[PDB]
Amino acid sequence: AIGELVRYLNTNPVGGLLEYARSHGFAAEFKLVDQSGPPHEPKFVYQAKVGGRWFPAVCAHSKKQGKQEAADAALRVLIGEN
Amino acid sequence: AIGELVRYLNTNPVGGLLEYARSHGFAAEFKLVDQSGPPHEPKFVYQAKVGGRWFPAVCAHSKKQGKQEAADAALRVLIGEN
RNA sequence: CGAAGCCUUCGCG
RNA sequence: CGAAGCCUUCGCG
RNA sequence: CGAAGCCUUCGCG
RNA sequence: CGAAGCCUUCGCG
């Protein structure tokens, strides 16, 4: 797992986390924790969840980048574990 | 653990998480993920972390209530574990 | 006795 | 052959 | 929201 | 920021 997981951090973190989620029979989730700010400069706060494990919450400027950074944080956490 | 952990959900989640963290030799952290909103109506976003495990991020109106809500979520998860 | 944590109140900014 | 996901681009509200 | 291109991965062969 | 009060937990006697 670790090998491909490292690869996914640079190119496409969301894809790597979904891959991890499939290969362990788990459904991945990206929770929109919070939305704030004016419409032209909003701030989104996202959190990745896999099965029963929750990951670092992140601030981002767009929903896409919210998911990307949430995935990225989850991936770094999982790589750290071993 | 589960017995006392249930009790702390009503009275003081922050204390219960501190008990859990001590009794498994873990350092607890309450991360201020985000602050937003106007000065008289701020919104804070907190996340509890115990050792290497991160917990649901929560919204609250004050820092203390932020920590308490994060702790409460972590406790509900840990009771869920068994 | 020695600590730690929470909540509450009061004053100040 | 059948899915899914990123990258970029274009158009619509 | 509607598409195209390109990449990666999954699944059945 | 400076105090006060409560409750809870832990160790010791």
Side-chain angles (χ1 to χ4, degrees):
Chain A
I2 290 315
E4 226 167 287
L5 293 209
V6 172
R7 152 151 81 80
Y8 278 108
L9 272 177
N10 300 337
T11 59
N12 171 22
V14 166
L17 196 69
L18 274 297
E19 183 65 13
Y20 178 81
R22 274 183 189 169
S23 68
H24 302 60
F26 285 133
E29 299 158 45
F30 291 96
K31 283 220 180 81
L32 181 51
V33 177
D34 177 50
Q35 191 170 346
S36 70
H40 58 287
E41 196 175 4
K43 171 159 64 166
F44 303 91
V45 171
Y46 268 103
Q47 205 185 355
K49 177 212 199 180
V50 179
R53 194 173 180 173
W54 312 74
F55 297 91
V58 195
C59 305
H61 294 318
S62 62
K63 281 189 181 187
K64 184 196 276 200
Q65 182 212 34
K67 293 171 169 204
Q68 288 293 349
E69 285 179 350
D72 183 289
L75 289 199
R76 308 187 165 274
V77 168
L78 289 188
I79 290 179
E81 313 292 280
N82 41 61
Chain B
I2 291 315
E4 226 167 285
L5 294 209
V6 171
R7 154 152 81 81
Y8 281 103
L9 272 176
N10 302 337
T11 61
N12 172 24
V14 168
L17 199 71
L18 281 176
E19 289 272 10
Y20 176 82
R22 280 169 192 163
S23 71
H24 302 62
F26 289 136
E29 297 160 44
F30 291 96
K31 288 216 183 170
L32 183 51
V33 179
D34 178 50
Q35 190 170 346
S36 70
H40 61 290
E41 194 178 3
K43 171 158 64 166
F44 302 97
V45 173
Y46 271 101
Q47 205 183 354
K49 181 214 198 184
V50 179
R53 192 175 180 175
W54 311 73
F55 295 89
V58 193
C59 306
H61 289 312
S62 61
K63 283 185 185 185
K64 284 178 315 186
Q65 184 211 35
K67 296 171 171 206
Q68 289 294 353
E69 286 256 66
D72 178 280
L75 290 200
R76 309 188 166 277
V77 168
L78 288 190
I79 291 179
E81 309 289 280
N82 41 61

